[PDB]
Amino acid sequence: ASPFRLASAGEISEVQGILRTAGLLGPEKRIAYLGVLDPARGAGSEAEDRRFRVFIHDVSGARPQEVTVSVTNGTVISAVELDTAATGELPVLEEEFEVVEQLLATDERWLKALAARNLDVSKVRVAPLSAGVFEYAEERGRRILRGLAFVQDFPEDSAWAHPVDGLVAYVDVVSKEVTRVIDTGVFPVPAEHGNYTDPELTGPLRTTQKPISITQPEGPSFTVTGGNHIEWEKWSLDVGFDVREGVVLHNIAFRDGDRLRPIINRASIAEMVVPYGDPSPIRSWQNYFDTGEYLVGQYANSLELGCDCLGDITYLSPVISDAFGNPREIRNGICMHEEDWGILAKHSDLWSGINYTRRNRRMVISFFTTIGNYDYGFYWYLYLDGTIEFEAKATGVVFTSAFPEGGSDNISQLAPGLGAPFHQHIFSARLDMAIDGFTNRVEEEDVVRQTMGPGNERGNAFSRKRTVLTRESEAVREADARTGRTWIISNPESKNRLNEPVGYKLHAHNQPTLLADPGSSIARRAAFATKDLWVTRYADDERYPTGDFVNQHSGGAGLPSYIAQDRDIDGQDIVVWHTFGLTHFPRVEDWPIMPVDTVGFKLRPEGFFDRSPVLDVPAN
Template sequence: MRVGPKISLASIYDHDKDKYRRVMYRGYISELFVPYQDLTEEWYFRTFLDAGEFGFGICAVPLQPSKDCPKNAVFLDGYYTTRDGTPAKTENVFCVFERYAGDIMWRHSETILPGDTVEVREDVTLVVRMVSTVANYDYIIDWEFKQTGSIKVTVSLSGILAVKASKYTHKDQTEDGEELYGTLVAENTIGTRHDHFVNFHLDLDIDGHANSFVKTHLKTKVVPNSYGIPPSSPRRSYWTVVNDVAKTESDAKIRVGSGETELTVVNPNKKTKMGNDIGYRLIPGPAVGPMLLEDDHEQIRGAFSNYNVWVTPYNNSEKWAGGLFVDQSHGDDNLAKWTLRDREIENKDIVLWYTLGFHHVPVQEDFPIMPTWSGAFELKPNNFFERNPVLKVNSLKPTNWVNCSAHK
C-alpha cells in the first residue's frame, strides 16, 4: 500500500556452481520527497512525501495493454487493504515482460584471423513495471533484470505539471528582478520549479547475510625521479586503486560526485578462485542533491536526500526513509536520525539506501502533458562470477517482422 512493488529474494543462477545465488533480500521505493520552490503564501507548504502521505501502492493504476506494456507482457493484479479494513483489488497493476530493443550484450570482431571472425550476443532482459499516479504526476517504475546478473532500476516521470495562475501572458511583462518561482509555460500559467528525490531501500545479501560497504578511490601517483637509476618506463604518472571499507554508518554517507569512484557491497567471507572479494557495484544515476539548507524545516523532514548513499545495519523497524508517520512530521524519526547512532556496518547484515534525484525546471514542452523523463541506477556484479556468466548464451532465432507502411 505504501511503497508499491517490492522485489524479494532476487537471485541469479550460476551455471558454473549449478545453483541460485542471492543478490538482494528485498528492494523497494522507501520514500519520495517532492519540495516545490515557491515561497508565496499559497505554495510555500507544498513539500510532499508521496509514499508516506498518499501511498505509492494505493495510487497505482491499471496498466493499459499494448500501451503501458508491450504485447508480450503478462499482467498481475494487486491486492491491498482499504482504510476500513476491507480487501480491494487493482487489476493489471503490474506487468512482466521480456525486452529486446536491439541492444548488444557482448561482441567482438577478430580482424587478424582469416575470415574476420565476429561474435555478437543480443541483450534480452526481464522487466517488472508499475505506474503510480500521485495527484498530477505519473511515476513509471521499472525493475529490469539482465542475464549478466545486473539489476537496473528506472524511474520515469510524466503526467501534468503543477501550475499556478499568473497575470502575465509574456515574459517581457515581468519586472526586473521579480521572482516567478517557475517558468511561464503558457499564457497566464506558471510551471513551478521543484525536485523529486526517490529513495530506494536495498537490503542486499551478496551471497550471504554478512556484507561490507567498500568505497574505491582512484588516485594519481607520480613516479619519483631516482637519480642514477635507469627508469623502467618513461612514464611520469599513473593511477592506482585505494579501497576504503566503511566501518560505521558515518563512513558510508556519500554525495555522488564527491570523489568516490566506485561504491561496492562485498561479501568479505567469500572470494573468487583468484582471491577477490565477491560483490555488487552500485552504478549511480546523475549526481543530484538537495539545494535547500539542512536546517530548513521541510529539508529536515526529507533529510534522507542530504546524501545519495547511506548504509545501515539491518533493523526490521527501519523501513521508511522518511519515518513511520510522515503526515505533519518534524523529521525526528527518519534515516538521518537513525544514522546518528553511528552503528558498526562492517561484515554485517546491511541495508543500502540510494536516492535518485531530479531537479525540475519546467519548460514549455512540459505543458500541458509532460513527455517522459527518466533516471536510473544499476546494481552490477563485481567479481561475483568466476568469468563472463553469459559467454554461452545462444543468439536469438531469426524472426521475420511484418513490414509496416504509413496509411494514406
C-alpha cells in the same frame, strides 16, 4: 506455500474479521494502511506466520492505533494507541481528497475570496495537499490538509491550466473546520485551456506512424509459480506489492552453475519527496511525500495491453484493503515481460577469424501510479549479464501557478499568465543486501590521479582507491562525479576463483540532492535526501528513511536517528539507502502534458562471477 506470496483477498477478509471482533473496526474507524509483514530473520523454521500491520484512523477524534494481526493464528498480536503530536499523523485517506473542497465551499472567507475573483464556487477544484510542519502552533496534533484552487471551465476541462494564485486555505479534516484562509492578492486566472485531447489544440493527428508488432511466438522465457515467483535466465525472485511502497522485490538470486547465489534480499523505493522551490507564502510550505504521505501503491493504474505494456505481457493483480477492510483488486496493476536489449557482446578477431555476436535482453517489472497531477512509472530491469537497474519515469501534468508580471527567479513561464514553480523529485531506494549471503560490507571507490615522477615517468598512470565503511557514523556519503565515485557491496567471506571478495558496484546518476536550506523544515523531515548514500545495520523496524508516520511529523525520524546507533557494518547484515532524483526546471515542452523524463541507478557485478556469466547464451 511461500511466505513471500502476495496477500490474498481471503487474508484481507480474515484481517477485517479479526479487527471487527476485537472491537477495533467500528463505524468511525478507517484503515489508513494495511500490509503484510516480511518474515523475521531466521525463517529456517518454516513456522509460517502470516502477519499484517494496520494503521487505523478514527474520524471522530479518538486516537488512531497501530495494530499487528496474525491471520495464521487469527489473533491480534499488539495494538498501540498513537500520540500523533509526538510520532506523526497517519497517511492521507483517499476519502479526504474531496473533503477539503467541500468544507471550503461553505466557508464565508473562502467564498469572499472567490467572489472577488468572480469565480463560481461550483467550478473551483481544491487540491488536497499535505500540510508539513511549519510555524502554526495550533496544528500540532491536529489532522490538517492545505488547499490550493484550480478552475475547471467544464467537467472535462484540465483544471491545472487555471490555477487560482494568491489564495490558500488550511483545513482541520477531523473537526471539519477551516482554520485559516490566506489571500495575499488577486492574480489573473490564466485563460488558455490545456486540454491535450482537444482537436483545436492537437491539430490533425499524425497518420504517419506505422505499427511495431512485438510478439513471442513460443511464449515468454520466464515462468511464474506460486503466484509471484519468477524464474528467468538464471534469475530468481519474488514480486511483492505493498500499498505504501508499490512493487517490492524479494530474494533476488542468480543461479550460477548448480548453486543459487543471493544478491539482494529486499529492494524497494521506500520514500519519494517532491519539494517545491517557490518562496511565495502561497506555496513555500509545499513538499509532498508521495510514498510516505499518500501511499503510491494504492493509486496504481490498471495497465492496458498495447498502450501501457507492449508485447507478451504477464500481469499480476495485487490485492489491497479499502478503508473498511474490504479486499480490492488492482486489476493488471503490474506488468512483466522480457524485452530485446540490443547487442550483448560482439567481436570480430583479426587473428582467429572468429566473428562473434550475441544479443542482450532484459526482464521488465513495472507499475504506474497517479497521485493528483503527477504520474510515475516504476521500472525494475534484470539483464542477462547480472546487471540490476531501476528507472523512474516521471510524467503527468506539472503543478502550476500564475506567472508573476515582471518574471520570477523560481517559476517557469509555460503559457501567457501561467507558471510552473521549480521543484525536485527525489527517490530513496532501500536495498537490503545479501551479496552471496548476509555478511556484506560497503566500500567507496574513487579514481586516483597520479603525478608524473619516479615510478610514473611518462605521467600516464592512474589508479583507484577503496575505503571500507566500518560504522554507521561514517557511512553517510556524498557523490563525486569528478572522481568517478562508486560504491561496492562485497562479501569478505565469499571469494571468487582469484581469491578476491565477490561484489556488486552501485553506479549512481550523480544528480543534485536536496537543494533546500539545511535549516529548513523540509531538510529536517527529508534528511535522507541531503546525501547520496547511507548504510545501516539491518533491523526489523527500520523500514522507511523518513520513519513510519511521515504526515505532519516534525522531523529527525528515520535515517538520522538510525545511524546514531553507530552499529558495526563491516561484514554484517546491512542495508543500502540510495538517494537519487530529478531537479525540474519546467520547460514550455512540459505543457500541457509532460513527456516522460527518467532517473535511476544500477548495480553491476564486480568480480561476483568467475568470468563472464553470459558465455552460454546462444546465437539468435
